[PDB]
């Protein structure tokens, strides 16, 4: 009726924004550039953001890569699909901006599932693709071949379990938190803020491990070594059965890696199997602590550490 | 390989709840060549029926006389093939060993998922058949927790694939809603099953089709369990109409041939007290787990 | 309307309380639960009755995690409200306009389901009882009622026997007339009050027969048999043992299953309770434990509790 | 009376559980400085209030007539020293009612001579997923108390319960409430200082389905989820001259809060309330409220962003009627991002019900006018902050019915926005509210 004349006045939307936060999203964003020189034909409603656990700088090529095998696989697949080029440094190096796809470092707690990677598409009409949705999308592009699907399910069930068990159990918290945490680190306790971060890592390291054992039905396949983390007894009854399980996984995953050496020839564009072989190798050869998988792939698998480098030069310039 | 293999079953027959206890006793019986019989020479079968011996809770488990434990059918047959000196069931060559491991792992991870549905989430089979077996397999106080735990675990793996008097009448309408849901779900199950086995049969053609591999014994055990339940005729018809009566008849003939085999290669043993699973040992193990 | 007074008829009970002695006191179906529970009841007044109740449940899915109850009962008005997790709201109101006419309303909101509104009006005359119950009242544009209606009449022909009928009308959409069902109810009370028998005959021929007996001051028994040519029946037997320290209830069913429910009083304020039902033929076992604390709210009630 | 009266000795009853060396402190500070009869009565009232506030006695009765020279006899009823289990409810401001269990235990004086009280409390409710509190109170002196709090609590915060926040940590607090004011501040003013220091680890999660809506998936909110450990110092000053806490009829009240996270941020906040009655039987009560707040980022070169839970949020049935909760301030995509400075003002006119059948009931007619502003100021100049904080406000009027029970306040209003921004979440029409603090 006449109650639709209110409000009497309306002003333009509040345009005040915080500059402390806009500086935060510049040290956590890495932009994918186009393949041919530099150009942009995108609108703010047609660009996506890839959520990752963290980012490390490659020693040889210098590109920025995600730390987790699944995040790195999706990052490589997106680059191949869209013709992009891998990043080199965060936007703090280039204050100016233009519409491009970018990769953003997020916490695990940025979605109900507590798992990454995720895709954030659009600006005004925004869609969130979760880890499960990304897995289903990525898997449904290889169903044409029945034999390439057999290998693909082997990598992310046997080798994935071998990687996850080792990172959580045979590696220290100081090494786990550099891969699956976005928290800052300095390496030297000098300022009083460097004492508040190490104690934060000590407190929160355990709860980050639990949210990682739920990403790929790990808590269902191994439901006895994920209940040993949810209590404080540290008895030898649960610590002898555990080493038996971890020894079977490593012995199985050596056969997988030895078998793959026979088929590492690509007659052109890499397939989704090659991009999944390469991501595991690149992520393994990043760990500083001498884990058994890294030792094995450095000593007996000197042909896989070259194949991964060969497939990575398709995306860096 | 000296040790002992524990299983689900009784009277020398493996029960149908465990689809890999059935596939493991067909394995030993098919090791008749000189190199293959050395793989299992020295093994003994025990129908202990207590998961307290398993390293991760699953009863198909191998204990090698010195504390080494392996669990599941996939891990046992992979371990055994790595104890061949290299000097019925065939042994795969080196050039196509990864493919065979991939096939066997695929069956375990994707097709054995469906058989748990048919055993614990299908009401027509769980209500009248599955719950009865545990009364004969376990002991008097341990008759109720195990079926419930297995049923609860079976929906976690299959959730994302297969989803006065007037008050009495209204609640009876809920029953009709239940049959509506049950006829909704069967269309999802039959669509997933016809896609899993179609992938498996398309991948299997890359190897030799005239020999029996360790991966075929786990696929056939799944069909044997799945078509041997009271709700098995619908699946028998659905698979047949889409794959071929002659093909499925050949597979059923192979299943029958495996079932009717002499138990001469077997060498089984009466379980000892410490590996019985009775009330006293269950309490002892429960107390030791917290110490 | 003259010989009726000379017959000296006795006012019969309500239709819903024919087998109250059997299915409510002797039996334990409503009392049974699962999981662990803790109850804290706090009453602030008695003559102007008012109290609250705090209930915690764990280990079970049927019982809500948190329950809050608040009830107020004056001389002629009763009002009880219940709040459960997920915003489950329940409200019951009774009002006696007279010693004969009583009207009550029950409203339930499930926070995701349509609200259930229920009305009941009952009249307990000198020698008969008449009650009318409506669920979801609704009248179309032509004035035709749509919903659920239950109208029951029960009159005692003699101080021992009571006969009556019940009519249920169900109309869902209103386009078509609703279905009507007629049932008969009968009740007999023994001269020495040793046993009470109740019988119900439904419109489909189903027969329900219940009997309550009191062996002594502390021991009572009850039997209830329902049956539906294709005739199928179920028989339930129950026993109730009443003592100052504890109260036991046991139930055995014709299907081969048993159930027990015991309330043990250990302290003047604390009273614990336990329940367990097993079925050897169906392999169905349920257990439940709980406790209840009663604490006075006002100082006068606290001193009365203390002494 | 102005009779010069001296007090020499006090005889107590039932004060066995409390140490005489600590009861003599109360007596010396309160009751034995009287020099007349009116002052003696006032000191007796102050002593009774203090002893019922420090949980030493349920109530106190004192006889004075026994003789100038006289001795005052004082009676104490011992509280239950054993386990005390209690249940109850509490009313949160944002339309959430919480239910709690509480186990209280007094500690015998043979262990600690200072009256010490330990209680464990369990909370639950609509938004509260869970909450365990361990509280320890120690009465150091008749005008000072020391509190230790250990808490672990998980709940939902934002609109549609979009965020899930869990907090674990501890707090140490010192409360100072002077016995006697210096004759400047026949009334009973309340005045206290409170200094606290806490350390807290908190986790923020976006528990909102991405398919449902683009809500909570803006750039700002994706960067807030995670873990952080913080420590803060803080001070609170409260002065209260109002004749009644929950149903005032006259007087003013002032609250002044500061907190500091060293090297991270500095927050300050002030609020004033004034009440003036205008009729012989207080028919027309007028009420005014003004609150302001300012937050500054102390970190170097604008690093270390301030968390969204530490910023100022405005709008709602309690803060500014006529707008939805978290319905004011700048927004990134659809999410309220708070502000570093705010101002808010409210003006209410209560009226007693005109009909003689209902006069003494607490139901009252209500006409209100509200407004405010919430901005992200630049850290440059308070001059610029005030310049941009004094234009384009967001006002709202309305009329309704209020129930001011001493336990809680209920409100049913019909509200109309007067002026707002385009992206504001207005709510015109009927609005219901309940709680304790309103504007």
PDB file of N, CA and C in Angstrom, chain D residues 102-171:
ATOM      1  N   UNK D 102      24.991 -26.330  36.988  1.00  0.00           N
ATOM      2  CA  UNK D 102      26.042 -25.690  37.773  1.00  0.00           C
ATOM      3  C   UNK D 102      26.288 -26.503  39.035  1.00  0.00           C
ATOM      4  N   UNK D 103      27.523 -26.963  39.218  1.00  0.00           N
ATOM      5  CA  UNK D 103      27.935 -27.664  40.429  1.00  0.00           C
ATOM      6  C   UNK D 103      28.881 -26.749  41.194  1.00  0.00           C
ATOM      7  N   UNK D 104      28.449 -26.300  42.366  1.00  0.00           N
ATOM      8  CA  UNK D 104      29.198 -25.360  43.185  1.00  0.00           C
ATOM      9  C   UNK D 104      29.727 -26.050  44.437  1.00  0.00           C
ATOM     10  N   UNK D 105      30.909 -25.620  44.886  1.00  0.00           N
ATOM     11  CA  UNK D 105      31.531 -26.221  46.062  1.00  0.00           C
ATOM     12  C   UNK D 105      32.302 -25.123  46.796  1.00  0.00           C
ATOM     13  N   UNK D 106      31.986 -24.941  48.074  1.00  0.00           N
ATOM     14  CA  UNK D 106      32.788 -24.075  48.920  1.00  0.00           C
ATOM     15  C   UNK D 106      33.947 -24.867  49.508  1.00  0.00           C
ATOM     16  N   UNK D 107      35.080 -24.200  49.690  1.00  0.00           N
ATOM     17  CA  UNK D 107      36.288 -24.828  50.208  1.00  0.00           C
ATOM     18  C   UNK D 107      36.417 -24.484  51.684  1.00  0.00           C
ATOM     19  N   UNK D 108      36.706 -25.493  52.504  1.00  0.00           N
ATOM     20  CA  UNK D 108      36.806 -25.285  53.942  1.00  0.00           C
ATOM     21  C   UNK D 108      37.941 -24.324  54.271  1.00  0.00           C
ATOM     22  N   UNK D 109      37.749 -23.541  55.335  1.00  0.00           N
ATOM     23  CA  UNK D 109      38.725 -22.522  55.697  1.00  0.00           C
ATOM     24  C   UNK D 109      40.047 -23.117  56.161  1.00  0.00           C
ATOM     25  N   UNK D 110      40.078 -24.405  56.505  1.00  0.00           N
ATOM     26  CA  UNK D 110      41.331 -25.005  56.945  1.00  0.00           C
ATOM     27  C   UNK D 110      42.333 -25.164  55.811  1.00  0.00           C
ATOM     28  N   UNK D 111      41.888 -25.115  54.556  1.00  0.00           N
ATOM     29  CA  UNK D 111      42.789 -25.142  53.411  1.00  0.00           C
ATOM     30  C   UNK D 111      43.194 -23.741  52.970  1.00  0.00           C
ATOM     31  N   UNK D 112      42.218 -22.879  52.700  1.00  0.00           N
ATOM     32  CA  UNK D 112      42.462 -21.485  52.357  1.00  0.00           C
ATOM     33  C   UNK D 112      41.638 -20.609  53.286  1.00  0.00           C
ATOM     34  N   UNK D 113      42.292 -19.650  53.936  1.00  0.00           N
ATOM     35  CA  UNK D 113      41.614 -18.747  54.855  1.00  0.00           C
ATOM     36  C   UNK D 113      40.815 -17.674  54.129  1.00  0.00           C
ATOM     37  N   UNK D 114      41.039 -17.502  52.829  1.00  0.00           N
ATOM     38  CA  UNK D 114      40.272 -16.577  52.016  1.00  0.00           C
ATOM     39  C   UNK D 114      39.059 -17.290  51.452  1.00  0.00           C
ATOM     40  N   UNK D 115      37.857 -16.738  51.607  1.00  0.00           N
ATOM     41  CA  UNK D 115      36.657 -17.415  51.096  1.00  0.00           C
ATOM     42  C   UNK D 115      36.787 -17.730  49.616  1.00  0.00           C
ATOM     43  N   UNK D 116      36.874 -19.018  49.308  1.00  0.00           N
ATOM     44  CA  UNK D 116      37.086 -19.501  47.954  1.00  0.00           C
ATOM     45  C   UNK D 116      35.929 -20.399  47.537  1.00  0.00           C
ATOM     46  N   UNK D 117      35.574 -20.307  46.260  1.00  0.00           N
ATOM     47  CA  UNK D 117      34.383 -20.963  45.736  1.00  0.00           C
ATOM     48  C   UNK D 117      34.680 -21.499  44.346  1.00  0.00           C
ATOM     49  N   UNK D 118      34.460 -22.795  44.131  1.00  0.00           N
ATOM     50  CA  UNK D 118      34.781 -23.431  42.861  1.00  0.00           C
ATOM     51  C   UNK D 118      33.504 -23.998  42.267  1.00  0.00           C
ATOM     52  N   UNK D 119      33.174 -23.598  41.041  1.00  0.00           N
ATOM     53  CA  UNK D 119      31.994 -24.158  40.402  1.00  0.00           C
ATOM     54  C   UNK D 119      32.308 -24.541  38.964  1.00  0.00           C
ATOM     55  N   UNK D 120      31.601 -25.567  38.503  1.00  0.00           N
ATOM     56  CA  UNK D 120      31.724 -26.088  37.147  1.00  0.00           C
ATOM     57  C   UNK D 120      30.364 -25.971  36.481  1.00  0.00           C
ATOM     58  N   UNK D 121      30.331 -25.385  35.291  1.00  0.00           N
ATOM     59  CA  UNK D 121      29.075 -25.059  34.639  1.00  0.00           C
ATOM     60  C   UNK D 121      29.048 -25.602  33.216  1.00  0.00           C
ATOM     61  N   UNK D 122      27.874 -26.092  32.828  1.00  0.00           N
ATOM     62  CA  UNK D 122      27.641 -26.668  31.508  1.00  0.00           C
ATOM     63  C   UNK D 122      26.502 -25.907  30.847  1.00  0.00           C
ATOM     64  N   UNK D 123      26.753 -25.378  29.649  1.00  0.00           N
ATOM     65  CA  UNK D 123      25.787 -24.573  28.914  1.00  0.00           C
ATOM     66  C   UNK D 123      25.328 -25.312  27.667  1.00  0.00           C
ATOM     67  N   UNK D 124      24.105 -25.001  27.237  1.00  0.00           N
ATOM     68  CA  UNK D 124      23.609 -25.458  25.945  1.00  0.00           C
ATOM     69  C   UNK D 124      22.435 -24.597  25.502  1.00  0.00           C
ATOM     70  N   UNK D 125      22.159 -24.624  24.204  1.00  0.00           N
ATOM     71  CA  UNK D 125      21.121 -23.762  23.670  1.00  0.00           C
ATOM     72  C   UNK D 125      21.045 -23.867  22.164  1.00  0.00           C
ATOM     73  N   UNK D 126      20.309 -22.922  21.576  1.00  0.00           N
ATOM     74  CA  UNK D 126      20.068 -22.942  20.136  1.00  0.00           C
ATOM     75  C   UNK D 126      21.362 -22.750  19.354  1.00  0.00           C
ATOM     76  N   UNK D 127      22.112 -21.691  19.670  1.00  0.00           N
ATOM     77  CA  UNK D 127      23.357 -21.424  18.958  1.00  0.00           C
ATOM     78  C   UNK D 127      24.550 -22.117  19.597  1.00  0.00           C
ATOM     79  N   UNK D 128      24.517 -22.333  20.909  1.00  0.00           N
ATOM     80  CA  UNK D 128      25.634 -22.953  21.610  1.00  0.00           C
ATOM     81  C   UNK D 128      25.687 -24.441  21.296  1.00  0.00           C
ATOM     82  N   UNK D 129      26.685 -24.850  20.512  1.00  0.00           N
ATOM     83  CA  UNK D 129      26.939 -26.274  20.337  1.00  0.00           C
ATOM     84  C   UNK D 129      27.304 -26.922  21.664  1.00  0.00           C
ATOM     85  N   UNK D 130      28.239 -26.326  22.399  1.00  0.00           N
ATOM     86  CA  UNK D 130      28.597 -26.838  23.718  1.00  0.00           C
ATOM     87  C   UNK D 130      29.391 -25.770  24.451  1.00  0.00           C
ATOM     88  N   UNK D 131      29.421 -25.880  25.779  1.00  0.00           N
ATOM     89  CA  UNK D 131      30.163 -24.928  26.595  1.00  0.00           C
ATOM     90  C   UNK D 131      30.445 -25.478  27.986  1.00  0.00           C
ATOM     91  N   UNK D 132      31.724 -25.616  28.331  1.00  0.00           N
ATOM     92  CA  UNK D 132      32.138 -26.028  29.666  1.00  0.00           C
ATOM     93  C   UNK D 132      32.931 -24.887  30.282  1.00  0.00           C
ATOM     94  N   UNK D 133      32.553 -24.473  31.488  1.00  0.00           N
ATOM     95  CA  UNK D 133      33.244 -23.403  32.194  1.00  0.00           C
ATOM     96  C   UNK D 133      33.690 -23.918  33.552  1.00  0.00           C
ATOM     97  N   UNK D 134      34.941 -23.655  33.903  1.00  0.00           N
ATOM     98  CA  UNK D 134      35.440 -23.876  35.251  1.00  0.00           C
ATOM     99  C   UNK D 134      35.764 -22.522  35.858  1.00  0.00           C
ATOM    100  N   UNK D 135      35.115 -22.197  36.969  1.00  0.00           N
ATOM    101  CA  UNK D 135      35.257 -20.891  37.589  1.00  0.00           C
ATOM    102  C   UNK D 135      35.707 -21.046  39.031  1.00  0.00           C
ATOM    103  N   UNK D 136      36.664 -20.210  39.421  1.00  0.00           N
ATOM    104  CA  UNK D 136      37.163 -20.172  40.788  1.00  0.00           C
ATOM    105  C   UNK D 136      37.176 -18.729  41.258  1.00  0.00           C
ATOM    106  N   UNK D 137      36.438 -18.445  42.325  1.00  0.00           N
ATOM    107  CA  UNK D 137      36.343 -17.111  42.894  1.00  0.00           C
ATOM    108  C   UNK D 137      37.041 -17.086  44.244  1.00  0.00           C
ATOM    109  N   UNK D 138      37.780 -16.012  44.506  1.00  0.00           N
ATOM    110  CA  UNK D 138      38.465 -15.830  45.776  1.00  0.00           C
ATOM    111  C   UNK D 138      38.244 -14.408  46.260  1.00  0.00           C
ATOM    112  N   UNK D 139      37.739 -14.270  47.482  1.00  0.00           N
ATOM    113  CA  UNK D 139      37.420 -12.962  48.050  1.00  0.00           C
ATOM    114  C   UNK D 139      38.635 -12.461  48.818  1.00  0.00           C
ATOM    115  N   UNK D 140      39.542 -11.790  48.103  1.00  0.00           N
ATOM    116  CA  UNK D 140      40.779 -11.320  48.719  1.00  0.00           C
ATOM    117  C   UNK D 140      40.518 -10.316  49.832  1.00  0.00           C
ATOM    118  N   UNK D 141      39.564  -9.416  49.636  1.00  0.00           N
ATOM    119  CA  UNK D 141      39.317  -8.323  50.566  1.00  0.00           C
ATOM    120  C   UNK D 141      37.854  -7.931  50.444  1.00  0.00           C
ATOM    121  N   UNK D 142      37.318  -7.183  51.414  1.00  0.00           N
ATOM    122  CA  UNK D 142      35.898  -6.813  51.352  1.00  0.00           C
ATOM    123  C   UNK D 142      35.520  -5.963  50.150  1.00  0.00           C
ATOM    124  N   UNK D 143      36.472  -5.531  49.331  1.00  0.00           N
ATOM    125  CA  UNK D 143      36.161  -4.678  48.193  1.00  0.00           C
ATOM    126  C   UNK D 143      36.968  -5.118  46.976  1.00  0.00           C
ATOM    127  N   UNK D 144      37.298  -6.405  46.906  1.00  0.00           N
ATOM    128  CA  UNK D 144      38.103  -6.916  45.807  1.00  0.00           C
ATOM    129  C   UNK D 144      37.904  -8.417  45.698  1.00  0.00           C
ATOM    130  N   UNK D 145      37.759  -8.905  44.471  1.00  0.00           N
ATOM    131  CA  UNK D 145      37.582 -10.334  44.228  1.00  0.00           C
ATOM    132  C   UNK D 145      38.456 -10.745  43.051  1.00  0.00           C
ATOM    133  N   UNK D 146      38.862 -12.014  43.034  1.00  0.00           N
ATOM    134  CA  UNK D 146      39.761 -12.550  42.023  1.00  0.00           C
ATOM    135  C   UNK D 146      39.120 -13.777  41.394  1.00  0.00           C
ATOM    136  N   UNK D 147      38.991 -13.768  40.072  1.00  0.00           N
ATOM    137  CA  UNK D 147      38.305 -14.820  39.338  1.00  0.00           C
ATOM    138  C   UNK D 147      39.264 -15.490  38.368  1.00  0.00           C
ATOM    139  N   UNK D 148      39.200 -16.815  38.307  1.00  0.00           N
ATOM    140  CA  UNK D 148      39.924 -17.596  37.313  1.00  0.00           C
ATOM    141  C   UNK D 148      38.911 -18.405  36.517  1.00  0.00           C
ATOM    142  N   UNK D 149      38.962 -18.281  35.194  1.00  0.00           N
ATOM    143  CA  UNK D 149      38.006 -18.911  34.297  1.00  0.00           C
ATOM    144  C   UNK D 149      38.754 -19.761  33.284  1.00  0.00           C
ATOM    145  N   UNK D 150      38.327 -21.003  33.123  1.00  0.00           N
ATOM    146  CA  UNK D 150      38.876 -21.904  32.109  1.00  0.00           C
ATOM    147  C   UNK D 150      37.698 -22.331  31.245  1.00  0.00           C
ATOM    148  N   UNK D 151      37.748 -22.018  29.956  1.00  0.00           N
ATOM    149  CA  UNK D 151      36.582 -22.221  29.114  1.00  0.00           C
ATOM    150  C   UNK D 151      36.919 -22.974  27.836  1.00  0.00           C
ATOM    151  N   UNK D 152      35.926 -23.731  27.375  1.00  0.00           N
ATOM    152  CA  UNK D 152      35.941 -24.403  26.081  1.00  0.00           C
ATOM    153  C   UNK D 152      34.516 -24.387  25.558  1.00  0.00           C
ATOM    154  N   UNK D 153      34.295 -23.691  24.446  1.00  0.00           N
ATOM    155  CA  UNK D 153      32.929 -23.492  23.982  1.00  0.00           C
ATOM    156  C   UNK D 153      32.883 -23.365  22.466  1.00  0.00           C
ATOM    157  N   UNK D 154      31.900 -24.037  21.876  1.00  0.00           N
ATOM    158  CA  UNK D 154      31.668 -24.054  20.440  1.00  0.00           C
ATOM    159  C   UNK D 154      30.252 -23.576  20.156  1.00  0.00           C
ATOM    160  N   UNK D 155      30.110 -22.703  19.156  1.00  0.00           N
ATOM    161  CA  UNK D 155      28.807 -22.127  18.843  1.00  0.00           C
ATOM    162  C   UNK D 155      28.769 -21.643  17.399  1.00  0.00           C
ATOM    163  N   UNK D 156      27.614 -21.097  17.018  1.00  0.00           N
ATOM    164  CA  UNK D 156      27.399 -20.482  15.714  1.00  0.00           C
ATOM    165  C   UNK D 156      27.274 -18.974  15.876  1.00  0.00           C
ATOM    166  N   UNK D 157      27.773 -18.230  14.893  1.00  0.00           N
ATOM    167  CA  UNK D 157      27.870 -16.786  15.065  1.00  0.00           C
ATOM    168  C   UNK D 157      27.030 -15.975  14.091  1.00  0.00           C
ATOM    169  N   UNK D 158      27.251 -16.114  12.791  1.00  0.00           N
ATOM    170  CA  UNK D 158      26.809 -15.091  11.857  1.00  0.00           C
ATOM    171  C   UNK D 158      25.392 -15.377  11.364  1.00  0.00           C
ATOM    172  N   UNK D 159      24.974 -14.658  10.321  1.00  0.00           N
ATOM    173  CA  UNK D 159      23.631 -14.810   9.778  1.00  0.00           C
ATOM    174  C   UNK D 159      23.432 -16.214   9.230  1.00  0.00           C
ATOM    175  N   UNK D 160      22.243 -16.768   9.465  1.00  0.00           N
ATOM    176  CA  UNK D 160      21.891 -18.132   9.087  1.00  0.00           C
ATOM    177  C   UNK D 160      22.818 -19.161   9.718  1.00  0.00           C
ATOM    178  N   UNK D 161      23.475 -18.801  10.822  1.00  0.00           N
ATOM    179  CA  UNK D 161      24.481 -19.651  11.457  1.00  0.00           C
ATOM    180  C   UNK D 161      25.539 -20.087  10.443  1.00  0.00           C
ATOM    181  N   UNK D 162      26.008 -19.120   9.652  1.00  0.00           N
ATOM    182  CA  UNK D 162      26.969 -19.429   8.608  1.00  0.00           C
ATOM    183  C   UNK D 162      28.314 -19.878   9.144  1.00  0.00           C
ATOM    184  N   UNK D 163      28.800 -19.227  10.195  1.00  0.00           N
ATOM    185  CA  UNK D 163      30.103 -19.527  10.765  1.00  0.00           C
ATOM    186  C   UNK D 163      29.959 -20.386  12.011  1.00  0.00           C
ATOM    187  N   UNK D 164      30.992 -21.183  12.260  1.00  0.00           N
ATOM    188  CA  UNK D 164      31.089 -22.026  13.444  1.00  0.00           C
ATOM    189  C   UNK D 164      32.395 -21.680  14.137  1.00  0.00           C
ATOM    190  N   UNK D 165      32.312 -21.258  15.393  1.00  0.00           N
ATOM    191  CA  UNK D 165      33.466 -20.744  16.115  1.00  0.00           C
ATOM    192  C   UNK D 165      33.658 -21.552  17.386  1.00  0.00           C
ATOM    193  N   UNK D 166      34.884 -22.018  17.598  1.00  0.00           N
ATOM    194  CA  UNK D 166      35.258 -22.718  18.814  1.00  0.00           C
ATOM    195  C   UNK D 166      36.385 -21.984  19.516  1.00  0.00           C
ATOM    196  N   UNK D 167      36.260 -21.859  20.834  1.00  0.00           N
ATOM    197  CA  UNK D 167      37.224 -21.142  21.655  1.00  0.00           C
ATOM    198  C   UNK D 167      37.680 -22.033  22.798  1.00  0.00           C
ATOM    199  N   UNK D 168      38.984 -22.025  23.070  1.00  0.00           N
ATOM    200  CA  UNK D 168      39.560 -22.733  24.204  1.00  0.00           C
ATOM    201  C   UNK D 168      40.573 -21.820  24.871  1.00  0.00           C
ATOM    202  N   UNK D 169      40.497 -21.677  26.188  1.00  0.00           N
ATOM    203  CA  UNK D 169      41.528 -20.900  26.850  1.00  0.00           C
ATOM    204  C   UNK D 169      41.173 -20.540  28.274  1.00  0.00           C
ATOM    205  N   UNK D 170      41.810 -19.471  28.748  1.00  0.00           N
ATOM    206  CA  UNK D 170      41.717 -19.104  30.153  1.00  0.00           C
ATOM    207  C   UNK D 170      41.712 -17.590  30.294  1.00  0.00           C
ATOM    208  N   UNK D 171      41.188 -17.142  31.434  1.00  0.00           N
ATOM    209  CA  UNK D 171      41.066 -15.735  31.780  1.00  0.00           C
ATOM    210  C   UNK D 171      41.311 -15.552  33.270  1.00  0.00           C
TER     211      UNK D 171
END
